[PDB]
A paper describes a structure:
Liver intestine (LI)-cadherin is a member of the cadherin superfamily, which encompasses a group of Ca2+-dependent cell-adhesion proteins. Human liver intestine–cadherin (LI-cadherin) is a nonclassical cadherin composed of an ectodomain consisting of seven extracellular cadherin (EC) repeats, a single transmembrane domain, and a short cytoplasmic domain. Because human LI-cadherin is expressed on gastric cancer cells but not on normal stomach tissues, LI-cadherin has been proposed as a target for imaging metastatic gastric cancer. Previous studies have reported that LI-cadherin works as a calcium ion–dependent cell adhesion molecule as other cadherins do.
The crystal structure revealed a dimerization architecture different from that of any other cadherin reported so far. It also showed canonical calcium-binding motifs between [name] and EC2, and between EC3 and EC4, but not between EC2 and EC3. Each EC repeat was composed of the typical seven β-strands seen in classical cadherins, and three calcium ions bound to each of the linkers connecting [name] and EC2, and EC3 and EC4. A previous study had suggested that LI-cadherin lacks a calcium-binding motif between EC2 and EC3 (9), and our crystal structure has confirmed that hypothesis experimentally. We also observed four N-glycans and two N-glycans bound to chains A and B, respectively, as predicted from the amino acid sequence. Indeed, our crystal structure indicates that the few N-glycans present in LI-cadherin are directed toward the opposite side of the homodimer interface, suggesting that the protein chains belonging to the homodimer do not participate in cis-interactions. The interaction was largely mediated by EC2 of one chain of LI-cadherin and EC4 of the other chain, engaging in hydrogen bonds and nonpolar contacts. The dimerization surface area was 1254 Å2, and a total of seven hydrogen bonds (distance between heavy atoms < 3.5 Å) were observed. Although Phe224 does not engage in specific interactions (such as H-bonds) with the partner molecule of LI-cadherin in the crystal structure, it buries a significant surface (71.8 Å2), that is, 95% of its total accessible surface, upon dimerization as determined by the PISA server.
Author numbering:
A (entry chain A): 26 to 442
B (entry chain B): 26 to 443
């Protein structure tokens, strides 16, 4: 059990234990009387004359992991009679070494609004202990982010791999105008971090946030019916790096899409617009590499079409017909003529006024009618009408907007009670 | 009815009526034989000698509203024997006149962000018909506002009085930079607007909206512990007119209020601030006329106190004591020293790091302890401790922030296994 013949053997011993202790008692048989220890003794392992193998110094896995020893039996004369046989000492590991970061100071940089979770810098540390045991198994962690807005982490670190990346929130909020420069303190721990007794090292990471010039531009307003020569530049986008191939992606599949994009990222309008066909547009600008692989998120472009006065007022019909009783007196409501304008509601482009131009016949007098200037309502201006005297009136009404006029024809039929 | 003794009476007749019938037959007993009509006859009202009172053409309430007539009975000689008595003709009104605006074009202006509902311009119209009847009772109304942003009315009009003012939304969103200049078309209707037969007039109203320079300034950042001469200008407010009386109002009603305002509207900090007693301030700037009237709403002032590193790290107590057993081996965790810094959390001002300076005694050797640079945790660095070789260690730990260093003292008592 702690004694026995010379045969191949392996013992496993913890390093860093008190330089006492026996390993094993080897047993003789005549003609053999003494024993000899050779190999990687490293002035640590010793055999007594009569078979007692032991070590006299602390072992160290880090200086040497396995000791390859040989034990021979000698006869009384001093000649080898058994062996040598190999005795193997496996030095079992303890956590006697602190992890060390390969640099005390790190620098990285990351583009604003880059994919969260993507490595931009690695911090690497090592531990001289056994990677196949807690003792040499490392766990990284952010100690502080400086500066820090409202307890919100803009960076994170992969607890195993040492990869530093932006969080969701960093991708989104990190702005080099507000804050171009961040310090991270990183801690590494052995024992996979899972012990209060683990050994720790720290290091410093300076991070520069580089500019992103790929952003959604300001909403565009374009006047319809452009009298100017086309195409016209209306907005632009720029990829961070040169060489990109620019597309425009039209989200509805419109009949004519009157915007396109050139190779510098300039967005042009091809044609005149018409408010009256098409009020507004949304589409996307996309950046490509030489390979046809999208470079980033697409960009939302908005075009508002401003109205011009490019439709005149129209008549509700070739002749609009109203009937009035003779028993009706000064100020009767007769009817409302409502002309239409295709230009933009509630603007001066579509805001009609009304004037009576002609009245035939003028009997018994002219001016028997008024039309309310904006409501378009016809009232009797003077007296009652008399079917006996004239059965019917024909009015020419001038409907006009800001800079167009239109003539519309109204018939007033006189009826009895 | 239609006949009776000569007595005071009152009849009511529509204007614009061509007469078809007499008004009344007055009867008198002998000695009375004929009758006489006097007063406001306007060569319209007539009495026949035989007592027959009537009118001879259309009346007009606008030319005359009440006719005050007298009828007397006469004798064969021509002497009065009854009366004269008052006969009253009330001319009942009809809606034969359009309302008219006194001007076809109106011009006004209003200061941006002024009191909504407050008249700045009056449009007046008149109607010759009877105020006491729908026929001469006027109703104003906006036809259109040009331009109009997102179907939102920036102006309104008092339907009776003709007063034009800003709506709530005009007060708030009207921006003279984007758009200083608005047209209103205003309609007036008789019949109190309630009839589709009413008569209408319209007018044009041109409005310029003047700029408001009375606005809340951008929030201020002021460093604490200013070494500069006080008071220090930090922001400003301006009323639209000169002669405003600028004041400051502290809501928190603090013991020490370290801001002031001068008569130009300039806002000062009066003293050094200290983040560590007081982090931020809010107060209000107020404008008054020379009698004490809030020239307008108060203005909200925000002062953020920026931190400087002006407190050094502190010790959790003069001596911090931990106990270690002899059976504790390399790397066993002993204890955590947590120093304090009053400066701003989660900044470099308060971010402590730890170094062991001294270990006494150095027996059996120096360097038996390490401290985790930021966690402040003491671990055994080399070997076990032995009460035989000293019952106690004394460590001097240098706690330092960005600019200051402080020595804190840790005592390790070596004790027996249990
Ligand atoms: C760019 O602006 C042009 C205006 O300079 C736009 O042309 C207008 O197009 C509308 C719709 O097609 C036409 O409206 C028609 O109006 C006629 C009566 O028009 C009469 O009025 C004008 C006097 O202003 C006179 O020039 C003519 O002799 C006509 O007698 C109605 O019968 C129809 O129902 C219809 O409403 C306009 O007439 C036309 N104006 C002109 C000057 O050509 C053009 O569409 C704009 N383009 C875009 C694409 O936005
Ligand atoms: C403006 O800045 C001033 C200086 O930066 C601030 O003065 C500080 O006031 C605090 C407490 O009110 C003091 O902190 C005390 O520190 C001692 C230990 O002090 C030793 O170390 C300091 C710094 O190196 C050294 O100067 C001394 O000689 C000492 O040997 C503790 O025992 C206290 O509890 C407390 O922490 C600072 O001592 C003092 N610093 C200085 C450099 O004068 C001032 O209060 C600031 N005012 C505002 C309005 O912000
Ligand atoms: C009112 O307008 C109508 C429509 O044009 C007139 O009637 C036309 O009169 C012409 C000759 O003047 C005839 O040849 C047509 O047969 C009529 N058209 C129709 C369909 O009735 C009418 O004359 C006008 N009346 C007045 C009093 O102006
Ligand atoms: C770090 O560096 C060492 C070489 O000295 C290498 O063997 C190791 O694989 C590297 N680790 C990481 C996490 O990239
Ligand atoms: C380390 O990272 C993985 C996620 O990648 C996570 O599941 C695990 O919980 C983390 N370890 C600790 C101790 O947080
Ligand atoms: C006009 O305003 C009065 C109060 O001034 C209000 O009571 C009345 O309802 C309004 N009339 C209409 C038609 O809204
Ligand atoms: Ca070792
Ligand atoms: Ca280790
Ligand atoms: Ca080891
Ligand atoms: Ca058009
Ligand atoms: Ca139009
Ligand atoms: Ca148009
Ligand atoms: Ca009249
Ligand atoms: Ca009247
Ligand atoms: Ca009237
Ligand atoms: Ca302070
Ligand atoms: Ca401070
Ligand atoms: Ca500090």
């Amino acid at each position: 059990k702690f004694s026995g013949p010379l045969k191949p053997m392996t013992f496993s011993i913890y390093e860093g234990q008190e330089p006492s202790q026996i390993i094993f008692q080897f047993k003789a048989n005549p003609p053999a009387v003494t024993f000899e220890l050779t190999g990687e003794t490293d002035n640590i392992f010793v055999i007594e004359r009569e078979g007692l193998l032991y070590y006299n110094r602390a072992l160290d896995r880090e200086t040497r992991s396995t000791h390859n020893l040989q034990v021979a039996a000698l006869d009384a004369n001093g000649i080898i009679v058994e062996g040598p046989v190999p005795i193997t000492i496996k030095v079992k590991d303890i956590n006697d070494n602190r992890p060390t970061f390969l640099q005390s100071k790190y620098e990285g940089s990351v583009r604003q609004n880059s994919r969260p979770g993507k490595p931009f810098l690695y911090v690497n540390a090592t531990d001289l202990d056994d990677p196949a045991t807690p003792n040499g198994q490392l766990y990284y962690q952010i100690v502080i982010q400086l500066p820090m807005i409202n307890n919100v982490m803009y960076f994170q670190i992969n607890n195993k791999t040492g990869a530093i990346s932006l969080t969701r929130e960093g991708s989104q909020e990190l702005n080099p105008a507000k804050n171009p420069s961040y310090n991270l303190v990183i801690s590494v721990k052995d024992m996979g971090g899972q012990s209060e007794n683990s050994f720790s090292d720290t290091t410093s990471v300076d991070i520069i946030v580089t500019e992103n010039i790929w952003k959604a531009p300001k909403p565009v307003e374009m006047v319809e019916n452009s009298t100017d020569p086309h195409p016209i530049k209306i907005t632009q986008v720029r990829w961070n790096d040169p060489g990109a191939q620019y597309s425009l992606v039209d989200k509805e599949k419109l009949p004519r899409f009157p915007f396109s994009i050139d190779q510098e990222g300039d967005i042009y309008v091809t044609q005149p617009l018409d408010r009256e066909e098409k009020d507004a547009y949304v589409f996307y600008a996309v950046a490509k590499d030489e390979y046809g692989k999208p470079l980033s998120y697409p960009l939302e472009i908005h075009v508002k079409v401003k109205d011009i006065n490019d439709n005149p007022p129209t008549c509700p019909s070739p002749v609009t017909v109203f009937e009035v009783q003779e028993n009706e007196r000064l100020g009767n409501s007769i009817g409302t003529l409502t002309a239409h304008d295709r230009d933009e509601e509630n603007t001066a482009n579509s805001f009609l006024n009304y004037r009576i131009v002609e009245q035939t016949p003028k009997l018994p007098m002219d001016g028997l009618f008024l039309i309310q200037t904006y409501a378009g309502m016809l009232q009797l201006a003077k007296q009652s009408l008399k079917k006996q005297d004239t059965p019917q009136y024909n009015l020419t009404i001038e409907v006009s907007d800001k800079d167009f006029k239109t003539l519309c024809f109204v018939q007033i039929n006189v009826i009895d009670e």
